[PDB]
Design a protein around this nucleic acid. Structure first.
Lengths: 210, 114, 148, 59
RNA sequence: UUGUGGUAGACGAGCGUUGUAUUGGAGUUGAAGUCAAAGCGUGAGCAUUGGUGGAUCCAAUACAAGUGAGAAUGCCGGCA
RNA sequence: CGAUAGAAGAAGCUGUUGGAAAGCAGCGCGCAAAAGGGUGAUAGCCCCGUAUUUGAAAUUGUUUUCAUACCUAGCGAGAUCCCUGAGUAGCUCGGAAAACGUUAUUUUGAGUGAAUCUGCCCAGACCAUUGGGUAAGCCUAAAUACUAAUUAGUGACCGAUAGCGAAACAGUACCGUGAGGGAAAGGUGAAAAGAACCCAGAGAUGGGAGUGAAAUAGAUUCUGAAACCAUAUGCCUACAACGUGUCAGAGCACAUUAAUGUGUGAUGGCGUGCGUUUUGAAGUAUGAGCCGGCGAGUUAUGAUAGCAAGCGUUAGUUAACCA
């Protein structure tokens, strides 16, 4: 494809860059994308919910009623799931992993596909490492730059590979903007953000990673 | 992850009991009893819907044969007269309603002469 | 897609209810019938249990294995029809492990198998060979040296 | 799960299913048997389709 | 054209609620809950309105249920 | 390098309805902080706090270096010189562990009992060759289970019937002599700002009255559902054989999610409950007084079958482990 670099002046650079056709997807599979964003959502539990079973609850060994001469339920156990003692017979447990195995073949295929769409979504504007120099950690200049870039409509993601300090000194006092590494991104993250800036150096590495 | 359905059950029983009304005494006050009353009333209403059409034709046969045998002829005679010649589509209820229409039944009796 | 329009294609197949609802049915034992041992909770039949009939294993004789306490040595077999798909030439154990036909961190005796004639002369370094396979590979002008 | 040790000692597995079984009644007396029965029971067979529903679930 | 008896039982298609997550909105110019009245639904339900009410929700989508109460001589509690 | 005291730390006015504005709208600013909490309704700029910048007298924990205790030290050569871990290995009678239900091997309650590295053990009886090591002495951080707790934080955790029995002064109250068993229950309000003053009444209590936006906030103080108790608008019922209602319907009083409307029915026709299990119950077969919540097919792993997908003819795929 093709995309124009954006500058700190709030406008695109007059020099477009050519992109190889090997990166743009030609077989669109979104159900694998749906599974990938699920597995990103999955494995997010903390094992905080639990319950006690019939034997996990305490109590005495008294029998509420004997074998006969009773006008109500036999009730041979001191504690039951339906008694006031509580405890769901099945309930939740802190051992339900609920983790789904996914193969990296389809995952990487869908990831390359979604990266192709997101780089051709028109929401991306190529940036570089130079503009963040001479800048400080003040979110005032960052907010002003985003207002000039008018990217406040959606969450702006900053792919990072060289770790410019001014970037992480910002984007914390604001809600939409956040920063993560190129590997650390996810399909769920890409679609949820719907806005991002890319450094010019990770292009070749991303294409090689495919 | 405790899930409570008290409000859902209360709303369900409320909408179930809203149908039941005008019963005898405390009958429209118990959810379980009113359920059975409503179901039985619906079944009997369906039965009456099925059999009222069954009995209304007989009712009109009574009410028309009264007039016919008051003129000296059975309902069978009228059915035969309709059957052979000058077959009519005038319904047994509408021919019965012709009693409610003054100076009309005479027109039928003079017309069926043959 | 998006988190507001995320839709499946053929997922979420039909489920079964065993203790909820009767207007939609399947609130009773739900497939176990009524008044049965299996209908009771955890009511089933053991695999050897046949209702009183003798289990099938104790009605028939048993196999006898002369290789008892002995583990047979495995043999990677090279069938000519299948290895025809393989493009390797001048075959040796060094080249085979590179193509992952056998595990690199493992060595196993090699047997030759298959009378399916091929049309290229190659170099074979195997440990065992079938007579018809040997004829097939010798008539194809390939060279075979038996290893031991 | 585990494979039944008692069961596995009496059935072999062939290509594409067709579980090979054994033949009984080889214990005591030949004179209670005919020549054809003796020469045919040596051959081994495979469980039936009706039996297969009771063999597949076994292991 | 066959049609729409049906238990067990098979099969198929859906709805309701909570939470998470993204896009939305309302709200001391009143949210939910509650009661009521003279609606819409093939039904799971959806409303509308009056007032109690005094700060929370609902709408659309997937994921997961201590998820869907007519009885269990069912558990407790209240009431004759 | 820390911990057991602590410090600093940024950014608003107007109007708005509202008791109360922080919500709402406009015009501004803000930064390592618009994490969070409180502040009269959910405040980035009211306050604390937070990111960040810092600090430990005395006590205590961890790491490194230095002077140093203690330890261990190579290569050869001669010699049938001496030694190398005895009730020991073992054999037998019963055993047990071993996946092993006594089988190689290991151990001994009873009996018996070698050799001295030329020897022995073992290489699932054993024997020969061969292989390896020489028991019959001991120690050993490292990866290992576990939290009773502390420190900070989190919860696709439960929200007073749940969650620890125990949010409430809870193993308390209470019971059995006693071992032991074993309770219920939170929310005024914004500030008590607690109902001042007056009247009836001995008082309690109630009514005015006031604070309070509000007393549909009055201490039974967030609301006050269902079951239950009355009360009356209107209608009907005192010749009446109905699982109690349906289809209708005179008349009466009304007028709604305005629609052949609602309520109600003198009277006509019709009609012997719900689940339950049985061949089956209006059943003199059983359960259910009713009401409110609650209340019973989950999960961990593995396999099979169906559908979809990825790959796809040596590919798929990693167990484990690590960032």
């Amino acid at each position: 494809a093709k995309l124009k670099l954006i500058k700190i002046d709030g406008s695109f650079e007059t020099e477009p860059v050519k992109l190889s056709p090997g990166l743009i997807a030609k077989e669109l599979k979104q159900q694998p994308v749906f599974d990938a964003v699920l597995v990103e959502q999955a494995s997010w539990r903390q094992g905080t919910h639990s319950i006690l079973t019939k034997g996990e609850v305490r109590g005495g060994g008294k029998k509420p009623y004997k074998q006969k001469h009773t006008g109500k339920a036999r009730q041979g156990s001191t504690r039951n799931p339906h008694f006031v003692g509580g405890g769901i017979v099945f309930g939740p447990k802190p051992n339900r992993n609920y983790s789904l195995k996914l193969n990296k073949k389809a995952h990487t295929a869908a990831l390359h596909t979604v990266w192709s769409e997101k780089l051709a979504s028109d929401n991306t504007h190529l940036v570089d490492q130079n503009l963040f120099n001479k800048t400080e950690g003040k979110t005032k200049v960052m907010m002003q730059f985003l207002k000039s870039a008018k990217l406040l409509d959606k969450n702006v993601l900053f792919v990072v590979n060289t770790l410019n300090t001014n970037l992480e000194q910002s984007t914390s006092n604001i809600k939409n903007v956040q920063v993560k590494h190129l590997d650390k991104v996810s399909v769920r993250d890409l679609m949820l953000a719907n806005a991002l800036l890319v450094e010019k150096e990770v292009l070749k590495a991303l294409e090689g990673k495919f | 992850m405790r899930i409570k359905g008290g409000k859902q059950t209360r709303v369900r029983r409320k909408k179930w009991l809203k149908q039941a009304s005008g019963s005898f005494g405390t009958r429209h006050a118990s959810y379980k009893v009113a359920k059975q009353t409503v179901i039985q009333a619906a079944k009997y209403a369906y039965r009456d819907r099925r059999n009222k059409k069954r009995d209304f034709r007989s009712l009109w046969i009574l009410r028309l044969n009264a007039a016919l045998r008051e003129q000296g002829m059975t309902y069978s005679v009228f059915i035969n007269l309709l059957k052979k010649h000058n077959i009519e589509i005038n319904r047994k209820v509408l021919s019965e309603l012709a009693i409610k229409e003054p100076s009309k039944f005479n027109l039928i009796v003079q017309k069926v002469k043959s | 897609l998006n988190q507001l329009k995320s839709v499946p294609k053929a997922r979420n197949h039909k489920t079964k209810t065993l203790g909820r609802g009767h207007g939609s049915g399947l609130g009773k034992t739900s497939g176990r019938g009524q008044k049965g041992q299996k209908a009771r909770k955890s009511g089933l039949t053991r695999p050897g249990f046949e209702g009183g009939q003798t289990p099938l294993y104790r009605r028939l004789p048993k196999f006898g294995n002369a290789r008892k306490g002995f583990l047979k040595q495995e043999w990677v077999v090279l069938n000519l029809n299948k290895i025809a798909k393989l493009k390797l030439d001048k075959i040796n154990r060094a080249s085979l492990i590179e193509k992952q036909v056998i595990s690199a961190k493992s060595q196993l005796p090699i047997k030759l198998i298959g009378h399916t004639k091929l049309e290229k002369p190659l170099h074979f370094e195997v440990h065992k060979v079938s007579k018809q396979a040997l004829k097939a590979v010798e008539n194809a002008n390939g060279s075979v040296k038996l290893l031991e | 799960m585990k494979v039944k040790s008692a069961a596995k000692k009496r059935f072999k597995l062939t290509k594409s299913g067709q579980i090979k079984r054994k033949h009984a009644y080889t214990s005591h007396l030949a004179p209670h048997k005919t020549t054809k029965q003796k020469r045919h029971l040596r051959k081994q067979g495979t469980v039936s389709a009706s039996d297969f529903k009771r063999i597949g679930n076994l292991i």
